[PDB]
Amino acid sequence: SPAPVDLGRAGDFVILAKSGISTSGATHVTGDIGVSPIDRTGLTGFSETMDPSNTFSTSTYVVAPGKLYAADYADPTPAKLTTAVSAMEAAYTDAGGRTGGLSVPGAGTILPATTLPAGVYTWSTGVTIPTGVTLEGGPDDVWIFQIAGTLDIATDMQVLLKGGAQAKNIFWQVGDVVTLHAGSHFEGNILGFSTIAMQTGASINGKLLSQKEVTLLGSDILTP
């Protein structure tokens, strides 16, 4: 079981994106979201209202007491986001740099009825999860997924946890676009180099931590 990835100040967020977060439909986020270095116009569809301090905003889509932060909000918000984004990049680099990676059968497809124990799992391709996957281990076990290409989980398919496996101990390092298809359910911390997209009724217990933009359609992003 590898050492966990330290998210540092990026772990203060449920969604953190460098180039924007968009939402439509009945989205539910439990936790704080942030965009930096893009300004507040990088938040789209939130109908957000500034706090009188101008340091944060609130939205129907970010369940109380969750707040929105943007790089052009009042001090000390720009510094907070600069620090968090630097932590996300360090986390991304740490996760992608681990050795001891295992090959998973299926040449970039997770085959039916696959159960993965704690470990580092490595692909030089993208990964597709067309029928979901099970992660089995204890409460301190760690999963680091190292994906050079895209990551997709198919419509209505699930990451299932057994044994005490916890979302906070699961890390997805992904070099290309992440797509969590309609009605899918995900677990863990997605350290995306590019877009992270969730579709209608998709859910995650964990974090979306993008070095580009996040797009949400009626999605649930829940702090465990």
Automatic annotation (TrEMBL):
Q: Which domain of life is it from?
A: Bacteria
Q: Which family does it belong to?
A: Belongs to the ice-binding protein family.
Q: What is this protein called?
A: DUF3494 domain-containing protein
* Organism, scientific name: Candidatus Cryosericum odellii
What range of the parent protein does this fragment cover? 106 to 329 of 841
